[PDB]
Design a protein around this motif. Structure first.
Motif, short mmCIF file in Angstrom:
data_model
loop_
_atom_site.label_atom_id
_atom_site.label_comp_id
_atom_site.label_asym_id
_atom_site.label_seq_id
_atom_site.Cartn_x
_atom_site.Cartn_y
_atom_site.Cartn_z
N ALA A 272 0.66 -1.06 0.46
CA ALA A 272 0.25 -0.28 -0.06
C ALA A 272 1.00 1.06 -0.09
CB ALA A 272 -0.97 0.01 1.69
N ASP A 273 1.55 1.31 0.73
CA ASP A 273 3.01 2.32 1.21
C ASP A 273 3.69 2.32 0.12
OD1 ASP A 273 2.14 2.77 3.64
OD2 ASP A 273 3.46 0.67 3.99
N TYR A 274 4.91 1.46 -0.19
CA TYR A 274 5.66 1.06 -1.48
C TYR A 274 4.97 0.64 -3.27
CZ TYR A 274 8.94 0.34 1.58
OH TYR A 274 9.67 0.42 2.51
N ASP A 275 3.06 1.16 -3.21
CA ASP A 275 2.48 1.34 -4.47
C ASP A 275 2.87 -0.11 -5.23
OD1 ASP A 275 1.53 3.32 -2.96
OD2 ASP A 275 1.11 4.02 -4.91
N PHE A 276 3.36 -1.46 -4.92
CA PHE A 276 3.45 -2.54 -5.44
C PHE A 276 2.01 -3.43 -6.79
CE2 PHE A 276 7.56 -4.19 -4.63
CZ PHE A 276 8.24 -3.02 -4.57
N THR A 277 2.25 -4.58 -6.31
CA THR A 277 1.21 -5.30 -6.72
C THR A 277 1.58 -6.43 -6.93
OG1 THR A 277 0.86 -5.99 -9.15
CG2 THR A 277 2.41 -4.58 -8.94
N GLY B 221 7.58 -18.00 -3.31
CA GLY B 221 6.21 -17.84 -3.33
C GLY B 221 6.11 -16.45 -3.10
N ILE B 222 4.88 -15.92 -4.03
CA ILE B 222 5.23 -14.24 -4.57
C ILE B 222 3.67 -14.49 -3.90
CG2 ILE B 222 6.45 -14.08 -6.41
CD1 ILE B 222 4.04 -14.38 -8.17
N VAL B 223 3.14 -13.03 -3.55
CA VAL B 223 1.84 -12.87 -3.60
C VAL B 223 0.87 -11.97 -3.72
CG1 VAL B 223 0.63 -11.99 -1.38
CG2 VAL B 223 2.43 -12.65 -1.25
N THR B 224 -0.09 -11.75 -4.65
CA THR B 224 -0.63 -11.20 -5.74
C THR B 224 -1.11 -10.06 -4.67
OG1 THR B 224 -0.60 -12.96 -6.57
CG2 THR B 224 -1.35 -10.37 -8.46
N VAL B 225 -1.56 -8.35 -5.38
CA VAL B 225 -2.34 -7.92 -5.14
C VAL B 225 -3.91 -8.04 -4.64
CG1 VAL B 225 -3.22 -6.05 -6.52
CG2 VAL B 225 -2.14 -5.03 -4.53
N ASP B 226 -4.41 -8.50 -5.47
CA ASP B 226 -5.94 -8.68 -5.65
C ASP B 226 -5.79 -8.69 -4.81
OD1 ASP B 226 -4.94 -11.36 -7.13
OD2 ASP B 226 -4.71 -9.84 -8.32
N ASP B 227 -5.16 -10.46 -4.31
CA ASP B 227 -5.11 -11.80 -3.40
C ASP B 227 -5.30 -10.19 -2.00
OD1 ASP B 227 -4.29 -14.63 -3.59
OD2 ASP B 227 -3.91 -14.13 -5.68
N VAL B 228 -4.09 -10.29 -1.73
CA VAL B 228 -3.80 -9.15 -0.21
C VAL B 228 -5.60 -7.87 0.09
CG1 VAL B 228 -3.07 -7.22 -1.40
CG2 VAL B 228 -2.94 -8.41 1.22
N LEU B 229 -6.07 -7.55 -1.64
CA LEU B 229 -6.88 -6.58 -1.73
C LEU B 229 -7.77 -6.76 -0.79
CD1 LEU B 229 -9.99 -5.40 -3.07
CD2 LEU B 229 -7.83 -3.99 -2.56
#
Ligand SMILES: [Mg+2]
Ligand SMILES: [Mg+2]
Ligand SMILES: [Mg+2]
Ligand SMILES: [Mg+2]
Ligand SMILES: [Mg+2]
Ligand SMILES: [Mg+2]
Ligand SMILES: [Mg+2]
Ligand SMILES: [Mg+2]
Ligand SMILES: [Mg+2]
Lengths: 442, 442
Positions: A217-222, A235-243
């Motif tokens: 949210a801060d580092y405006d990632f995805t 492993g990786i984490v998607t934004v729509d996943d954390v959204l």
């Protein structure tokens, strides 16, 4: 919403013509508006992809529900064309209901994938693990652009996302990112370790959702990279996943602003017996201390038989003092969460508040006492004003300094509900209307 | 956190060696932890980019705050290397304080950009407009892949994001998407209107944040296309951009769960005067109806002089009845929001609840009345049990059916706070302890 036509005959033809031109969501939208028959029949027709997706976007319980009904000839089919992370979490939904069906249904899964899922269950659902998908894109620092662009020309439909390529050394440790936005402009002959970024942000396999969340949210990632105890990229984490992790921890907090104290809680899904058991856990400890409210109104009965002609002024009085303590705690509580203010920002509030407190008490007193007269009891009218105000202040300063109190001890301040207030705001809120009436008659 | 070294001398050399290797955020983190001097001096050193970024992530008021202090030789500098959407919103921040500074400060802006922002201000900050950025990627249906990949080889550093290419006809209307994930595998000779997707989701220029938000959470997107009254593509919206719209409308909701009724509200930023004016707007209307609580305790004074020996049982009594109405309303309110339940789901709750209500009342009664005896008043002990219970029920059924009530009339249910309850739960919660005591003595 025309689908409800090519389905009434229970044919085959006219139906398949639809389950190919409609987006999964449209369905999900009209899914809880279906019948126990249509559903049981549609989740066996849409193509591998669509069917899989529409499932991962269903209540954990609604999921495992149709993993016991749906025809076994489609299980080993859906579980595959179903994203891994979505599976892991979903596959678990079953386990909370059938510790056997799990062990069994699990077999329908190809051992090449199973062994991967047999690792995403060992990670909690709070930490990264229960969110990170292994289907990522990882390259080596000693490669070219023309090479990575050609590495993605294939294996693109098998990775959650190829927009953010991660770099790792031979030992598998991470050491840089690589935005595709860059692989498109860079020269096809350029090395990877020269357009990459050595200053990479990451998250450990064990990091509360909320925490992981904040970063994106801060580092405006995805796309956030998950690492292990040693530093390997697993492993990786998607934004729509954390959204979602937000709305979740968001509703978990709005919930704890009442009695309702249960992790994942939905409503339509919970029989009266269910709400009862939880809701009443709190509603009880709350009326244990509230009980003391009436026990103290006793100790001061001698002088109370004198406050005989009055005392009708404990509802409006003890209540407004509560409403205050609320606004206070509410505001500060969420603050502590929005990373605004902190454990070191308590002094600054204590003060800031004293002002708002005595500020309000006065505006309010003019209102209460203005009628405490016009009502018909002009007699002892200070007990009313001196207390309402001597309290509104004393209250706002409680709900305001309580949330901190918990954090100083490590506890989700959200716990400090509104009712926990409208109660302790009745305890102390009374003792005042007593000394401000007893030593106001002698 | 070493920066606090190469800054104490107020030199120039040792400082700039830092404001180049430190990420914007680290600063933002230690920004509210700085002094009115260091800040006023750092926001004039960092490179165009970093300085611009760190500003867009500052409270709207803290923004315009440093746009009146910062040296004018840096303004026409920052305002450019500052993303447009973030500017639009940010530049407005000033307007709510200085309707002149705006018209003026605006001038320092290049007319090429200005005319663009002189269009993002005519769109509400609630609707898409105040979020959509014009720096997007739009191609034509009649082109090739080797052509679009070559069109992005340039103009890549001037577009918010080139991961999602949109398609539009000659008249500028939208007509399909085009994931880069696709432009990578498709054959360089393939037309655009053959790998694109005609079934595109979009959002109108005027669509409440929340609404626009939801979409990007269901359809698991990351880039939404904004269209106008006719259907032309005039802007896009990023996820990391909307990921905020949540925590915002999320905290606006947690706030309305108290008196606190003011749109955007931060804490550290609001002189007791600020909090006061808003907080007290509500705390007042609330103690207008609460006033009635003590006025009714009067009408029933004739029979009340009889209830002398007692009545100390209105705190624990009227309170628990309030706590109940809370859990209820809280749970249902958030539900209405989570798209769980609905305006058609009122009947199913009214019932479901009657159970939980009478279910609780009994558990509770056992507790209250168990001590209403051991306390020392075994006399008329039914008034306590009959009421506590006859109430807990009638309360929970209030906060439970209230939120819907508003929605039937179009009003953010969140408005139905907890104190709005702990008050109406005192009004009706009393009248019961009266009939359940008056017609329980004759
Ligand atoms: Mg952000
Ligand atoms: Mg995922
Ligand atoms: Mg948590
Ligand atoms: Mg929390
Ligand atoms: Mg109360
Ligand atoms: Mg709104
Ligand atoms: Mg989603
Ligand atoms: Mg943006
Ligand atoms: Mg809202």
């Amino acid at each position: 919403v025309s689908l409800q036509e090519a389905l009434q005959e229970g044919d085959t033809r006219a139906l398949r013509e639809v389950l190919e031109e409609i987006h999964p969501q449209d369905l999900l939208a009209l899914w809880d508006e279906l019948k126990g028959e249509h559903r049981y029949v549609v989740l066996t027709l849409l193509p591998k992809a669509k069917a899989a997706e529409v499932l991962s976007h269903l209540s954990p319980e609604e999921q495992a529900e149709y993993l016991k009904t749906l025809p076994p000839w489609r299980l080993r089919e859906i579980l595959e064309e179903l994203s891994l992370d979505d599976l892991a979490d979903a596959l678990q939904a079953v386990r909370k209901e059938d510790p056997a069906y799990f062990q069994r249904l699990k077999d329908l899964l190809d051992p090449r994938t199973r062994a991967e899922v047999e690792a995403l269950a060992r990670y909690e659902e709070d930490e990264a693990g229960g969110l990170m998908t292994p289907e990522y894109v990882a390259v080596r620092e000693g490669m070219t652009v023309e090479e990575v662009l050609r590495f993605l020309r294939r294996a693109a439909p098998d990775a959650e996302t190829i927009y953010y390529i991660y770099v790792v050394d031979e030992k598998g440790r991470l050491k840089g990112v690589l935005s595709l936005r860059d692989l498109i402009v860079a020269d096809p002959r350029t090395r990877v370790a020269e357009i990459m970024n050595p200053k990479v942000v990451y998250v450990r396999t064990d990091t509360d959702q909320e925490e992981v969340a904040r970063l994106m949210a801060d580092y405006d990632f995805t796309v956030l990279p998950v690492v292990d105890e040693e530093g390997r990229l697993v492993g990786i984490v998607t934004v729509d996943d954390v959204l979602d992790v937000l709305e979740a921890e968001a509703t978990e907090d709005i919930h704890k602003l009442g009695a309702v104290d249960v992790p994942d809680l939905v409503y339509s899904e919970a029989g009266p017996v269910a709400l009862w058991l939880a809701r009443v856990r709190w509603l009880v400890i709350l009326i244990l201390t509230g009980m003391v409210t009436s026990s103290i109104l006793q100790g001061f009965e001698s002088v109370l038989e004198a406050v005989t002609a009055l005392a009708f002024y404990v509802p409006v009085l003890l209540g407004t003092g509560g409403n205050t303590g609320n606004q206070s705690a509410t505001l500060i509580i969420r603050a502590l969460a929005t990373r605004d203010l902190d454990l070191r920002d308590w002094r600054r509030v204590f003060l800031k508040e004293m002002g708002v407190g005595l500020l309000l008490g006065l505006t309010l007193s003019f209102l209460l006492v203005g009628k405490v007269y016009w009502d018909g009891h002009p007699l002892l009218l200070p007990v009313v004003g001196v207390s309402l105000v001597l309290i509104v202040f004393f209250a706002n300063l409680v709900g305001a300094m309580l949330p901190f109190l918990l954090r100083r001890l490590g506890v989700d301040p959200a716990l400090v509900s509104n009712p926990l207030v409208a109660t302790l705001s009745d305890v102390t809120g009374l003792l005042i209307y007593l000394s401000v009436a007893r030593l106001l008659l002698e």
